[PDB]
Design an enzyme around this catalytic site. Structure first.
Site, PDB file in Angstrom:
ATOM      1  N   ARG B 177      -1.460   3.476  -6.311  1.00 11.70           N
ATOM      2  CA  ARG B 177      -2.008   3.770  -4.990  1.00 11.70           C
ATOM      3  C   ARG B 177      -1.682   5.200  -4.559  1.00 11.70           C
ATOM      4  O   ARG B 177      -2.454   5.823  -3.826  1.00 11.70           O
ATOM      5  CB  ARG B 177      -1.475   2.777  -3.955  1.00 11.70           C
ATOM      6  CG  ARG B 177      -1.837   1.332  -4.232  1.00 11.70           C
ATOM      7  CD  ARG B 177      -1.041   0.372  -3.354  1.00 11.70           C
ATOM      8  NE  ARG B 177      -1.133   0.688  -1.929  1.00 11.70           N
ATOM      9  CZ  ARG B 177      -2.159   0.350  -1.154  1.00 11.70           C
ATOM     10  NH1 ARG B 177      -3.190  -0.302  -1.672  1.00 11.70           N
ATOM     11  NH2 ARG B 177      -2.157   0.664   0.140  1.00 11.70           N
ATOM     12  N   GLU B 312       9.249   0.164  11.121  1.00 11.80           N
ATOM     13  CA  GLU B 312       8.682  -0.873  10.262  1.00 11.80           C
ATOM     14  C   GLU B 312       9.741  -1.493   9.369  1.00 11.80           C
ATOM     15  O   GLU B 312      10.440  -0.783   8.654  1.00 11.80           O
ATOM     16  CB  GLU B 312       7.547  -0.280   9.415  1.00 11.80           C
ATOM     17  CG  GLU B 312       6.967  -1.192   8.375  1.00 11.80           C
ATOM     18  CD  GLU B 312       5.654  -0.651   7.826  1.00 11.80           C
ATOM     19  OE1 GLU B 312       4.854  -0.126   8.623  1.00 11.80           O
ATOM     20  OE2 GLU B 312       5.435  -0.754   6.609  1.00 11.80           O
ATOM     21  N   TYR B 363      -4.039  -7.609  -2.195  1.00 13.96           N
ATOM     22  CA  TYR B 363      -3.981  -6.644  -1.139  1.00 13.96           C
ATOM     23  C   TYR B 363      -5.278  -5.876  -1.247  1.00 13.96           C
ATOM     24  O   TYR B 363      -5.795  -5.587  -2.313  1.00 13.96           O
ATOM     25  CB  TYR B 363      -2.785  -5.706  -1.178  1.00 13.96           C
ATOM     26  CG  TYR B 363      -2.938  -4.694  -0.063  1.00 13.96           C
ATOM     27  CD1 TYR B 363      -2.717  -5.049   1.270  1.00 13.96           C
ATOM     28  CD2 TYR B 363      -3.401  -3.421  -0.333  1.00 13.96           C
ATOM     29  CE1 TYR B 363      -2.907  -4.130   2.296  1.00 13.96           C
ATOM     30  CE2 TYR B 363      -3.587  -2.505   0.673  1.00 13.96           C
ATOM     31  CZ  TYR B 363      -3.342  -2.856   1.981  1.00 13.96           C
ATOM     32  OH  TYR B 363      -3.541  -1.907   2.953  1.00 13.96           O
TER      33      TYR B 363
HETATM   34  C1  LIG Z   1       0.697  -3.907   7.679  1.00 15.10           C
HETATM   35  C2  LIG Z   1      -0.710  -3.790   7.138  1.00 15.10           C
HETATM   36  C3  LIG Z   1      -0.979  -2.418   7.045  1.00 15.10           C
HETATM   37  C4  LIG Z   1      -2.233  -1.992   6.565  1.00 15.10           C
HETATM   38  N1  LIG Z   1      -2.522  -0.559   6.465  1.00 15.10           N
HETATM   39  C5  LIG Z   1      -3.804  -0.153   5.978  1.00 15.10           C
HETATM   40  C6  LIG Z   1      -4.158   1.303   5.857  1.00 15.10           C
HETATM   41  O1  LIG Z   1      -3.375   2.202   6.158  1.00 15.10           O
HETATM   42  N2  LIG Z   1      -5.434   1.679   5.360  1.00 15.10           N
HETATM   43  C7  LIG Z   1      -6.405   0.650   4.974  1.00 15.10           C
HETATM   44  O2  LIG Z   1      -7.487   0.961   4.556  1.00 15.10           O
HETATM   45  N3  LIG Z   1      -6.048  -0.759   5.093  1.00 15.10           N
HETATM   46  C8  LIG Z   1      -4.784  -1.148   5.594  1.00 15.10           C
HETATM   47  N4  LIG Z   1      -4.503  -2.542   5.680  1.00 15.10           N
HETATM   48  C9  LIG Z   1      -5.545  -3.557   5.283  1.00 15.10           C
HETATM   49  C10 LIG Z   1      -6.478  -3.900   6.502  1.00 15.10           C
HETATM   50  O3  LIG Z   1      -5.801  -4.697   7.411  1.00 15.10           O
HETATM   51  C11 LIG Z   1      -7.783  -4.534   6.033  1.00 15.10           C
HETATM   52  O4  LIG Z   1      -8.791  -4.435   7.056  1.00 15.10           O
HETATM   53  C12 LIG Z   1      -7.681  -6.001   5.708  1.00 15.10           C
HETATM   54  O5  LIG Z   1      -7.012  -6.217   4.483  1.00 15.10           O
HETATM   55  C13 LIG Z   1      -9.101  -6.508   5.596  1.00 15.10           C
HETATM   56  O6  LIG Z   1      -9.179  -7.694   4.799  1.00 15.10           O
HETATM   57  P1  LIG Z   1      -9.481  -9.012   5.611  1.00 15.10           P
HETATM   58  O7  LIG Z   1     -10.605  -8.759   6.592  1.00 15.10           O
HETATM   59  O8  LIG Z   1      -9.839 -10.114   4.657  1.00 15.10           O
HETATM   60  O9  LIG Z   1      -8.082  -9.438   6.269  1.00 15.10           O
HETATM   61  P2  LIG Z   1      -7.633  -9.643   7.794  1.00 15.10           P
HETATM   62  O10 LIG Z   1      -7.641  -8.293   8.486  1.00 15.10           O
HETATM   63  O11 LIG Z   1      -6.210 -10.219   7.707  1.00 15.10           O
HETATM   64  O12 LIG Z   1      -8.528 -10.747   8.556  1.00 15.10           O
HETATM   65  C14 LIG Z   1      -8.331 -12.111   8.250  1.00 15.10           C
HETATM   66  C15 LIG Z   1      -8.631 -12.876   9.555  1.00 15.10           C
HETATM   67  O13 LIG Z   1      -8.701 -14.160   9.268  1.00 15.10           O
HETATM   68  C16 LIG Z   1      -8.008 -14.899  10.523  1.00 15.10           C
HETATM   69  N5  LIG Z   1      -7.703 -16.245  10.168  1.00 15.10           N
HETATM   70  C17 LIG Z   1      -6.791 -16.599   9.224  1.00 15.10           C
HETATM   71  N6  LIG Z   1      -6.780 -17.969   9.159  1.00 15.10           N
HETATM   72  C18 LIG Z   1      -7.706 -18.449  10.077  1.00 15.10           C
HETATM   73  C19 LIG Z   1      -8.103 -19.763  10.433  1.00 15.10           C
HETATM   74  N7  LIG Z   1      -7.681 -21.079   9.970  1.00 15.10           N
HETATM   75  N8  LIG Z   1      -9.046 -19.967  11.381  1.00 15.10           N
HETATM   76  C20 LIG Z   1      -9.619 -18.869  12.001  1.00 15.10           C
HETATM   77  N9  LIG Z   1      -9.246 -17.592  11.669  1.00 15.10           N
HETATM   78  C21 LIG Z   1      -8.279 -17.391  10.696  1.00 15.10           C
HETATM   79  C22 LIG Z   1      -6.969 -14.184  10.742  1.00 15.10           C
HETATM   80  O14 LIG Z   1      -6.402 -14.421  12.097  1.00 15.10           O
HETATM   81  C23 LIG Z   1      -7.506 -12.709  10.566  1.00 15.10           C
HETATM   82  O15 LIG Z   1      -7.971 -12.199  11.728  1.00 15.10           O
HETATM   83  C24 LIG Z   1      -3.205  -2.962   6.185  1.00 15.10           C
HETATM   84  C25 LIG Z   1      -2.925  -4.337   6.280  1.00 15.10           C
HETATM   85  C26 LIG Z   1      -1.681  -4.751   6.756  1.00 15.10           C
HETATM   86  C27 LIG Z   1      -1.276  -6.214   6.898  1.00 15.10           C
HETATM   87  O1  LIG Z   2       7.995   6.746  -0.318  1.00 17.54           O
HETATM   88  C1  LIG Z   2       7.467   5.850  -0.977  1.00 17.54           C
HETATM   89  C2  LIG Z   2       6.106   5.356  -0.841  1.00 17.54           C
HETATM   90  C3  LIG Z   2       5.618   4.359  -1.624  1.00 17.54           C
HETATM   91  N1  LIG Z   2       6.417   3.777  -2.603  1.00 17.54           N
HETATM   92  C4  LIG Z   2       5.950   2.673  -3.454  1.00 17.54           C
HETATM   93  O2  LIG Z   2       4.543   2.721  -3.551  1.00 17.54           O
HETATM   94  C5  LIG Z   2       3.984   1.526  -3.018  1.00 17.54           C
HETATM   95  C6  LIG Z   2       2.654   1.920  -2.273  1.00 17.54           C
HETATM   96  O3  LIG Z   2       3.009   2.620  -1.200  1.00 17.54           O
HETATM   97  P1  LIG Z   2       1.879   2.610   0.240  1.00 17.54           P
HETATM   98  O4  LIG Z   2       2.270   3.934   0.784  1.00 17.54           O
HETATM   99  O5  LIG Z   2       0.577   2.526  -0.563  1.00 17.54           O
HETATM  100  O6  LIG Z   2       2.338   1.292   0.916  1.00 17.54           O
HETATM  101  P2  LIG Z   2       1.615   0.524   2.311  1.00 17.54           P
HETATM  102  O7  LIG Z   2       1.261   1.672   3.255  1.00 17.54           O
HETATM  103  O8  LIG Z   2       0.427  -0.208   1.685  1.00 17.54           O
HETATM  104  O9  LIG Z   2       2.738  -0.403   2.784  1.00 17.54           O
HETATM  105  C7  LIG Z   2       5.047   0.977  -2.045  1.00 17.54           C
HETATM  106  O10 LIG Z   2       4.868  -0.400  -1.952  1.00 17.54           O
HETATM  107  C8  LIG Z   2       6.351   1.312  -2.797  1.00 17.54           C
HETATM  108  O11 LIG Z   2       6.671   0.405  -3.801  1.00 17.54           O
HETATM  109  C9  LIG Z   2       7.753   4.180  -2.808  1.00 17.54           C
HETATM  110  O12 LIG Z   2       8.484   3.660  -3.648  1.00 17.54           O
HETATM  111  N2  LIG Z   2       8.230   5.209  -1.985  1.00 17.54           N
END
Ligand SMILES: Cc1cc2nc3c(=O)[nH]c(=O)nc-3n(C[C@H](O)[C@H](O)[C@H](O)COP(=O)(O)OP(=O)(O)OC[C@H]3O[C@@H](n4cnc5c(N)ncnc54)[C@H](O)[C@@H]3O)c2cc1C
Ligand SMILES: O=c1ccn([C@@H]2O[C@H](COP(=O)(O)OP(=O)(O)O)[C@@H](O)[C@H]2O)c(=O)[nH]1
Ligand SMILES: Cc1cc2nc3c(=O)[nH]c(=O)nc-3n(C[C@H](O)[C@H](O)[C@H](O)COP(=O)(O)OP(=O)(O)OC[C@H]3O[C@@H](n4cnc5c(N)ncnc54)[C@H](O)[C@@H]3O)c2cc1C
Ligand SMILES: O=c1ccn([C@@H]2O[C@H](COP(=O)(O)OP(=O)(O)O)[C@@H](O)[C@H]2O)c(=O)[nH]1
Lengths: 393, 394
Positions: B177, B312, B363
């Site tokens: 990544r 975080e 993911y």
């Molecule tokens: C901490 C975190 C950080 C992230 N940072 C980034 C980033 O920097 N850049 C990037 O591009 N992406 C990032 N992502 C990914 C981002 O959130 C994506 O939009 C997501 O993975 C989209 O996939 P999804 O729509 O399937 O998941 P989700 O966004 O999780 O949507 C799934 C939905 O299903 C709902 N649901 C689950 N079970 C049920 C049920 N029984 N009934 C009704 N509703 C339900 C949930 O409440 C949720 O709203 C991050 C994700 C997380 C968790």
């Molecule tokens: O300073 C850093 C940044 C990233 N990572 C590794 O690289 C992975 C991807 O990092 P990202 O920045 O993509 O993580 P996210 O923002 O998805 O939590 C992480 O899970 C870590 O295992 C690390 O070891 N050190």
């Protein structure tokens, strides 16, 4: 020869902005007289034969502006890449984040300083003078970055580039550089920037493309002007060559800097991993090294060769083409005399003066273009189209 | 009108909303989106911090990037983007490092400038300590790729904090990544297109759900409402983006996930760290990263004297936690295999498709989720809705 409605001396961005405007916006016949064998002034680019890499003949030219007027204007002649300029500074064998920001501070002082911590540190180190009270380059620089950073990254670079007492250099020289307390290390602080997709020379040629524009290279104005103007007496002149030379140095010689370059093709795909590396120490003769491949990653450049260019600064002697106005207090007095001659020549001979060389000003591309657009709209166009005076109300 | 649904979508994250919007606007189909949370958007949901007014991302910081022009052109229907480019710095032994590993970090860490060629040689030789083939775990493999000094400094303990899983037992693609460079380029992503939504993520997401043919139910669990909804609309397929194991009552076991905790804090300074994201690579602080949201939107007029930061923290997702990242142990991949078989059978018998991060135990970045949804739409769901084609594939 004839017939022409306007003469432009010099084919840099100032001259070509004037030429293009008169030709397209008024349908005027323009003759552009260029003494060099190429167009474009110091912005001229050309391919290095071995590698095919486009080189900026006079060192790296980076376009940037916050003037939307100018941005709209120049985009009529070229597309721009999404390039954002960053410069690294070599000091005592280490490559530093630059310019002033939390990167430079944390690297130089050896640990992380928060924004507030860094502000406090520099405030102490700058305390010998307030920025508002600063009266020269050295004072202004110290007031902004503090004495330790001044001594390490400014003092010796400046000595190589100007070979002039920093107390006698203009304060505005240092304010060209952003001064930040974030990890932002963009070399400029302007809304718009990028590199011309097809290169500078294509952009310049596009500005000169109108059929009403004729460009004569390898021609010195002062050799041809008398007969040219005689055949076309109504035509005014816009001069963008060196101001003191125009008047045969009658009021003394202005101090200018010039540059020498060494171009070298190396048998590696990447010499320094960044377009421009500054060398801030007195122990190397060049001020910086340019590596042009990094300006156009999108092109078909070889992966096992690269072209670099070492840049060396010295005083412009009488044999040299000037690149930088120095503007010491002495220079500024000589300039005042030349500004008086210039205004007289405008009134008498209908000669306007513009650009870096024509006004002895430290002008970037975008400021030269803004200046020409203004000269055209406010002074030249009314002269050309209603016979308004060049001595404006 | 209302009801007479042609399609059920479970979950309103980017995957679910892409599906819903495409079905509605491209096929004229009536969609019910069922969302168990009190807001749409899944973890991309944004909101203003009340005291400062600064837009924050409560479920984790979100940075958008893609190299797919079709996806770029698609999302720009719903939002404009700023010219933001993501950069990350790394805090190690009291010093802030340029990151990811590139000539900046190399020069800082090893104490002098290394040219591209010098750095390539340095990393090669330090990495030579261990042969990548003979690596018996995460640690040995990391060392065999970047060398012992860089490993021990920036990956080892950060990895330990974020996954708390034996590094030898984590996916190799996890490190993929991060871009890997012998230049001074420190732009965190390598993708062609990026930026932040000009009016924020929540406005973007609301725009995706705006078509009148999309109806959204919030605070509603699909498993509470499905039997009577499907009985009333028996032909409608279901695109399920909830947890794969929960769907089948955890009958094949429970899939392993990491969760994150966040601590939002408002500080009486205009700028806490001068950059959007600071990784903390050392064990002496419990958080993995600190986000400072004002720096996500420099173009906005935020307070000059206050800032909101977010610490975080990473741990195992326990039963009442939100799953964020799949762990993928061998037991997990085995459990996943069993559920994948269950899922395929459910597609055949009940016309339920499984998608998204939770639905596939994968993911997915936002742009990955959107691309996956567009592909599901083109290849499977739209031909089904438009022509009665089979939902069964491969
Ligand atoms: C901490 C975190 C950080 C992230 N940072 C980034 C980033 O920097 N850049 C990037 O591009 N992406 C990032 N992502 C990914 C981002 O959130 C994506 O939009 C997501 O993975 C989209 O996939 P999804 O729509 O399937 O998941 P989700 O966004 O999780 O949507 C799934 C939905 O299903 C709902 N649901 C689950 N079970 C049920 C049920 N029984 N009934 C009704 N509703 C339900 C949930 O409440 C949720 O709203 C991050 C994700 C997380 C968790
Ligand atoms: O300073 C850093 C940044 C990233 N990572 C590794 O690289 C992975 C991807 O990092 P990202 O920045 O993509 O993580 P996210 O923002 O998805 O939590 C992480 O899970 C870590 O295992 C690390 O070891 N050190
Ligand atoms: C080393 C250097 C680096 C630079 N880097 C940047 C940068 O990174 N970004 C940026 O925005 N700007 C940069 N500039 C500024 C830029 O090169 C020009 O100065 C700017 O475009 C202003 O153009 P001009 O037309 O006023 O002057 P010039 O480009 O100098 O054009 C003047 C022309 O007049 C010609 N001429 C002179 N005398 C005669 C004569 N008797 N007869 C006929 N022709 C004559 C000259 O040959 C010359 O071509 C740099 C300048 C230099 C010297
Ligand atoms: O590493 C650097 C860069 C700039 N400068 C000073 O800042 C001035 C303006 O710098 P710029 O980068 O604008 O110079 P140019 O590219 O126009 O030669 C220079 O003349 C120097 O005096 C310096 O001392 N050290």
């Amino acid at each position: 020869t004839g017939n022409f409605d306007l003469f432009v001396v010099g084919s840099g961005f100032f001259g070509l902005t004037i030429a293009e405007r008169a030709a397209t916006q008024l349908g005027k016949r323009v003759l552009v007289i260029e003494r060099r064998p190429h167009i474009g002034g110091n912005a001229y680019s050309e391919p290095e034969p071995e590698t095919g890499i486009e080189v900026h003949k006079y060192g790296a030219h980076l376009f940037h502006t916050s003037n939307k007027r100018v941005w709209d204007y120049v985009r009529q002649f070229t597309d721009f890449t999404g390039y954002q300029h960053r410069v690294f500074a070599m000091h005592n064998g280490q490559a530093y984040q630059f310019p002033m920001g939390l990167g430079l501070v944390s690297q130089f002082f050896g640990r992380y300083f928060s924004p507030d911590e860094a502000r406090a540190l520099i405030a102490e180190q700058a305390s010998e003078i307030d920025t508002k009270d600063a009266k020269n380059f050295e004072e202004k620089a110290i007031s902004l970055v503090g004495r330790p950073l001044y001594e390490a990254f400014i003092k010796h670079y400046t000595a190589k580039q100007w070979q002039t007492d920093p107390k006698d250099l203009p304060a505005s020289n240092i304010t060209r550089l952003p001064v930040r307390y974030t990890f932002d290390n963009r070399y400029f602080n302007d809304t718009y920037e990028g590199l011309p997709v097809e290169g500078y020379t294509k952009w310049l040629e596009n500005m000169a493309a109108d059929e009403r524009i004729e460009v004569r290279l390898d021609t010195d104005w002062f050799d041809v002007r008398d007969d040219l103007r005689a055949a076309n007496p109504d035509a005014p002149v816009v001069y963008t060559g060196p101001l003191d030379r125009y008047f045969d140095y009658a009021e003394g010689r202005l101090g200018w800097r010039t540059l020498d370059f060494e171009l070298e093709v190396l048998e590696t795909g990447d010499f320094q991993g960044t377009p421009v590396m500054n060398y801030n120490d007195l122990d190397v003769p060049y001020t910086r090294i340019h590596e042009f491949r990094h300006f156009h990653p999108e092109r078909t450049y070889p992966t096992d060769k690269t072209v670099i260019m070492r840049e060396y600064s010295r005083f412009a002697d009488n044999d040299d083409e000037p690149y930088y106005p120095i503007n010491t207090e002495a220079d500024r007095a000589v300039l005042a005399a030349y500004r008086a001659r210039a205004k007289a020549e405008t009134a008498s001979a209908k000669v306007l003066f513009g650009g870096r060389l024509g006004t002895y000003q430290y002008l970037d591309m975008h400021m030269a273009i803004a200046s020409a657009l203004s000269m055209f709209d406010n002074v030249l166009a009314p002269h050309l189209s209603e016979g308004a005076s060049l001595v404006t109300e």
